[PDB]
Design a protein around this nucleic acid. Structure first.
Length: 896
DNA sequence: TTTT
C-alpha cells in the first residue's frame, strides 16, 4: 500500500446554511509522511450577496470574487486530487457536507473512504490546552497562524498540527494500541484506521522520562525539587533596596514596612491582622518577607489569595524578576486540595466500558496522553466540563484507593520542605483536613483579601440535592433490561439459567420494577418541593440568576425522602450475600444514591437550616435543596485559625468603627492578634473628592423611577462637562437595567458606549479602556472589589445606594443563627467594607485625580451614618444642587 | 432598621 495522503481542507462560505450558502474560498494542504507536500487554493465566485458579518470574519469582499471561477470548473480538477486522499478538516462535518453538496450540484459523487476530524485529534493530543479554536491553538504550540479566518492557514496550520499530533503519537507501543481500541467507539471518523497504520509501521525504542509504568498506564515521572537559596548575608532593607534597584521602581517606605511587619510576625509564632491599602505593591512585600524568612533559617510559608490574577502576577512575573536579582530561584508551587491532583486510579476508569458516552471514551484517551505530559497532575489542567466533568467528579468521589496507588498530591508532601514559598486559594484553605493534609507540613500562612474569607466559608458550608444529580445517578443504573447496569444483571441471570454459573438467583424483574418505583418516588419529592415553591414566598437573587424560597415546611419533603431511602434499601437487600463484581458494582451505585438521599434526610431531621433554590420557576428539573451542615465561624476557626502556627490576615478593609473587633468576632476562641495599619494613603486622600447630592430624593423601592431619573441626571451633567469615564455601582438589578435603557435612548450618550454586568464572563471591564477612554458608563451590581480604574482623565465612581443586604439573602439566611445582632455584627460591617472597597476603586495612581458621588441620603440622615462617614474622613466633602456639582467638575478639569 |  502506498502511504496515505491527507487532504486537509478548509472552506469559507457565505454562511452556515448548507442549502442556501455557497463556498467562496477553498484551501487544501496535502500531507504525506508528516510533511506538507503540496497545496491548492481557489477563490470561488458566487451570485449571492456576502453578508457584512461574513466579510468582516473572512476579509473577503465581493470585488475579490469577480475574477474567481465558479465551483463547476474547479470541481472537476479538485476531485481528482482528493478522490484518493484521506479527508481531513477542523470540525469536519461542515467542510465535508459543503464539499459534498457542491460536488453533487456538479454531478460529482464524493465519498472519501476515510474521514478525520482534527478537533477530536487536538482534544486527545493536546488535552491541557485551554482552547481548541485554531488560532489560539496555533499560537498555543508556536505555529505561525498568520492571518486567521483563511481557508489557507486553516488548511495549513491544521495540517501542521495534525503533523504535530502524529509526531506526538510516537509513544510506547502498547499505548498506541490502547487508543486504537478506544477509537472504535468515538464516531464514524475512521481515526482507528490511522492508529492501526501507525501500529503496523511502528518504530520501537525505550524512554526514561517514565522510570516505571502503573499497571497498564505509562506516566512522566514527576521531577522533584531542590533547595536553591543563597544567604543574602544582609537585612531585608538591603534586599528591598537591591531588588528595587534592579527592578527600577520607587523606594516606597510603607511597602517595606509591610514586609518587615509580616517577617517579624512570621519569625515568631504570632497571629496578626494587618490592614494595608498599598497602591498595588503588596505582592513584592509578601514574597520578599517569605524568601527573607527562607534565608533567615526559615521554613515553608503559605499565601492564600481571593482572586488568581494576583496569584499569577507574583508567580509568572515577580518571582522570575527576583530570581535574577537573588541569583537563585526558590522553588514555588501552586498548592491545591487532594482532589485537584490525579491518582493512577485511571486504570479503574480504563476498565469501565461506556461506549455510549462518546465524551467519556475521548476522556480516557485524553487522560492517557495527559498523564504522559502533565508535570503536576492537577485534574483542573484539563477544562473538565459537561458530561466529562460530571463523570470524572463522580469517579473521583467514589474512588477507593488501594495497592499503593501513586497520587500526584503526595508529590507536594515529599517536596514540602524544599518549597518554602507555596500559594493556594481561599476556597482550598477552608477545605477539610482529610483533603488538605499538606497543611500539616505548612504551619505558616499569609491570607490576602481575607475580608472575603467568610463568603467562601458560606459556599463550603452547605450540601445540596439536585434533580440533575439524581437523574444522572439513576441513568447510570439503567431503566430497562437493555440499559447499562440493568443489562449486565440480565446477562448474569441468563448465564445462571443457560451457562449454569454458580450464582444465586438474581431477580432482574424485581430490580427493574423497583428502579421504576424509585424514579416515581424521586418525581414525587421534586413535585412536592415545586408545590412548596408555588405555595410559598419566593425571592429573586441580585444577579437575577436563581429564585430562592427560605420559609417552608419540611414535613412532606422528609416523608418522600424516607420512602425513597427505604425502597433503595430494599432493592439493595435483594442482592445481599453476593460477591459477583457486576452485582458488587450495582450495590455500590445503589448505596451511593441511598446516601445522597439519606444525608439530606439526616440534616433535615437534625434541625439544620435549609432552603430551596430553583433556576427556572417553571421547570421542577432545576430544583436544588440546600442544608447547612456546618457553621461558618466554626469552619473559619477549626480549618484556618487552629491549623496554622502563624496566621497573618492582610486586607485593605478589615475594620468597622476603628477597631478589628468585628473581623475578630468571626472566630470562636478568643485568640490574641496583632493589629497594624499601613495607610500609604498619601496624596490620594486629597487628589480624590466626594459629593453628596442634596437635590436627590430618598431611595424607595416604592418609586425607584424618580431616583433613577436623578441618577441619570447626574450622569448627564458629568458626561457633558467632562468627556471621561464614569462607574456606577447599583444594588438593584432593576435600577441597573432602568438606567442603561434611559442612557441608551438619551442623545447626550451618543459616542458613549454604556456597559452593564452579565451573570457570567464579566470581560466588559477590558472594554472600559478599549478605545473608549473618553466614552464609557460601566454599570455594575456586585463588583465593588476586583476592578482597576485606569483612564486618561477625571474618574467618577457613583454609589447609587449604600451596599446593604436584604434579610432574604442566602448569606443572611445562613448567618442569622450565628450572630446575636446580624445587622450590627454582619450586614452593617459588610456594607462598610463593600462601600469602602468601591471608594478604593477610584484612586490607584496619585498622578491623576477623581470624584466620588453618593446619592443615598442615609449617609447624612440615618442613625448608623457615623460608620459610613468614618470611611470618608481623609476625603473632602461638598453637598449641593447639580449646579454646585457642575462648578466642582469644571474646577477639577481646569486644574491644569 | 434591610429590600427587588
Amino acid at each position: 500500500m502506498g502511504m496515505a495522503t491527507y487532504a486537509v481542507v478548509d472552506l469559507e462560505t457565505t454562511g452556515n446554511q448548507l442549502d442556501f450558502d455557497d463556498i467562496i474560498q477553498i484551501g487544501i494542504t496535502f500531507v504525506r509522511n508528516n510533511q506538507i507536500i503540496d497545496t491548492y487554493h481557489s477563490m470561488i465566485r458566487t451570485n449571492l450577496e456576502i453578508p457584512p458579518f461574513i466579510q468582516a470574519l473572512t476579509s473577503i469582499e465581493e470585488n475579490m470574487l469577480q475574477q474567481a471561477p465558479y465551483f463547476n470548473q474547479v470541481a472537476q480538477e479538485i476531485y481528482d486530487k482528493i478522490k484518493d486522499c484521506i479527508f481531513v478538516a477542523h470540525n469536519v462535518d461542515f467542510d465535508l457536507n459543503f464539499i459534498k453538496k457542491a460536488f453533487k450540484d456538479c454531478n460529482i459523487q464524493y465519498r472519501p473512504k476515510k474521514v478525520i476530524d482534527t478537533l477530536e485529534i487536538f482534544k486527545i493530543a493536546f488535552p491541557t490546552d485551554k482552547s481548541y479554536q485554531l488560532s489560539e491553538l496555533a499560537e498555543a504550540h508556536g505555529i505561525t497562524l498568520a492571518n486567521a479566518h483563511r481557508a489557507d492557514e486553516d488548511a495549513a496550520t491544521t495540517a501542521k498540527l495534525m503533523i504535530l499530533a502524529f509526531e506526538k503519537f510516537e509513544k510506547l507501543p502498547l499505548d498506541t494500541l490502547k487508543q486504537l481500541y478506544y477509537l472504535s467507539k468515538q464516531l464514524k471518523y475512521d481515526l482507528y484506521d490511522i492508529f492501526f497504520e501507525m501500529v503496523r509501521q511502528y518504530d520501537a525504542k525505550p524512554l526514561d522520562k517514565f522510570y516505571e509504568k502503573f499497571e497498564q498506564i505509562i506516566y512522566r515521572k514527576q521531577v522533584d525539587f531542590k533547595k536553591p537559596t543563597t544567604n543574602y548575608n544582609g537585612s531585608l532593607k538591603s534586599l528591598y533596596r537591591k531588588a528595587v534597584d534592579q527592578l527600577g521602581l520607587t523606594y516606597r517606605p510603607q511597602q517595606l514596612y509591610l514586609a518587615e511587619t509580616i517577617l517579624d510576625q512570621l519569625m515568631h509564632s504570632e497571629k496578626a491582622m494587618i490592614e494595608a491599602s498599598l497602591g498595588s505593591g503588596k505582592s513584592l512585600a509578601y514574597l520578599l518577607a517569605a524568601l527573607m524568612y527562607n534565608i533567615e533559617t526559615g521554613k515553608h510559608v503559605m499565601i492564600s489569595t481571593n482572586t488568581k490574577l494576583l496569584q499569577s502576577q507574583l508567580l509568572e512575573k515577580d518571582i522570575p524578576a527576583m530570581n535574577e536579582a537573588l541569583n537563585f530561584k526558590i522553588n514555588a508551587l501552586l498548592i491545591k486540595s487532594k482532589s485537584d491532583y490525579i491518582s493512577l486510579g485511571l486504570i479503574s476508569q480504563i476498565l469501565k466500558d461506556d461506549t455510549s458516552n462518546y465524551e467519556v471514551n475521548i476522556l480516557k484517551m485524553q487522560l492517557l496522553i495527559w498523564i504522559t505530559e502533565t508535570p503536576s497532575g492537577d485534574i483542573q489542567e484539563l477544562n473538565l466540563k459537561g458530561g466529562q466533568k460530571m463523570y470524572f467528579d463522580q469517579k473521583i468521589e467514589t474512588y477507593v484507593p488501594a495497592r499503593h496507588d501513586v497520587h500526584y498530591y503526595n508529590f507536594i508532601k515529599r517536596n514540602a520542605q524544599n518549597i518554602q514559598i507555596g500559594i493556594t486559594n481561599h476556597a482550598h484553605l477552608i477545605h477539610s483536613d482529610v483533603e488538605n493534609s499538606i497543611y500539616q507540613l505548612f504551619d505558616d500562612c499569609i491570607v490576602d483579601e481575607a475580608h472575603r474569607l467568610p463568603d467562601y466559608a458560606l459556599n463550603q458550608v452547605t450540601n445540596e440535592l439536585s434533580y440533575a444529580d439524581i437523574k444522572y445517578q439513576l441513568g447510570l443504573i439503567g431503566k430497562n433490561e437493555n440499559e447499562k447496569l440493568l443489562k449486565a444483571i440480565d446477562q448474569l441471570e441468563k448465564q445462571r439459567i443457560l451457562e449454569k454459573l454458580d450464582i444465586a438467583p438474581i431477580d432482574i424483574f424485581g430490580l427493574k420494577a423497583s428502579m421504576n418505583e424509585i424514579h416515581e418516588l424521586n418525581e414525587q419529592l421534586f413535585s412536592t418541593i415545586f408545590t412548596i415553591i408555588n405555595d410559598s414566598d419566593v425571592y429573586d437573587d441580585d444577579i437575577h440568576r436563581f429564585h430562592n424560597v427560605f420559609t417552608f415546611e419540611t414535613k412532606d419533603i422528609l416523608k418522600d425522602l424516607h420512602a425513597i431511602i427505604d425502597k433503595l434499601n430494599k432493592t439493595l437487600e435483594i442482592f445481599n450475600g453476593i460477591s459477583h463484581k457486576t452485582v458488587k458494582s450495582l450495590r455500590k451505585q445503589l448505596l451511593y444514591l441511598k446516601d445522597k438521599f439519606k444525608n439530606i434526610e439526616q440534616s433535615l431531621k437534625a434541625g439544620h437550616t435549609s432552603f430551596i433554590s430553583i433556576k427556572n420557576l417553571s421547570q421542577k428539573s432545576t430544583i436544588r435543596l440546600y442544608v447547612k451542615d456546618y457553621a461558618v465561624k466554626d469552619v473559619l476557626t477549626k480549618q484556618v485559625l487552629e491549623k496554622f502556627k502563624s496566621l497573618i490576615f492582610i486586607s485593605g478593609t478589615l475594620k468597622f468603627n476603628h477597631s478589628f473587633e468585628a473581623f475578630k468576632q468571626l472566630f470562636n476562641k478568643d485568640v490574641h492578634f496583632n493589629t497594624f495599619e499601613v495607610n500609604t494613603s498619601l496624596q490620594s486622600a486629597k487628589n480624590t473628592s466626594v459629593f453628596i447630592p442634596s437635590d436627590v430624593a430618598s431611595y424607595q423601592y416604592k418609586n425607584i423611577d424618580e431616583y433613577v431619573a436623578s441618577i441619570v441626571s447626574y450622569i448627564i451633567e458629568y458626561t457633558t462637562i467632562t468627556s471621561s469615564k464614569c462607574l456606577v455601582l447599583f444594588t438593584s438589578y432593576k435600577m441597573m437595567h432602568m438606567v442603561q435603557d434611559m442612557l441608551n435612548e438619551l442623545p447626550e450618550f451618543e459616542d458613549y458606549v454604556v456597559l452593564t454586568q452579565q451573570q457570567n464572563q464579566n470581560y466588559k471591564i477590558v472594554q472600559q479602556f478599549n478605545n473608549f477612554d473618553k466614552a464609557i458608563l460601566l454599570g455594575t451590581s456586585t463588583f465593588f472589589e476586583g476592578f482597576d480604574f485606569q483612564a486618561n482623565g477625571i474618574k467618577c465612581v457613583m454609589i447609587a445606594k449604600l451596599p446593604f443586604m436584604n434579610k432574604h439573602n442566602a448569606k443572611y439566611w445562613l448567618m442569622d443563627s450565628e450572630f446575636t445582632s446580624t445587622f450590627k455584627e454582619y450586614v452593617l460591617p459588610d456594607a462598610v467594607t463593600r462601600f469602602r472597597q468601591g471608594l478604593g476603586r477610584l484612586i490607584r495612581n496619585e498622578n491623576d485625580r477623581g470624584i466620588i458621588v453618593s446619592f443615598d441620603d442615609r449617609l447624612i440622615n440615618s442613625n448608623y451614618k457615623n460608620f459610613f462617614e468614618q470611611t470618608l474622613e481623609n476625603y473632602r466633602q461638598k453637598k449641593g444642587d447639580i449646579q454646585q456639582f457642575g462648578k466642582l467638575l469644571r474646577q477639577i478639569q481646569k486644574k491644569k
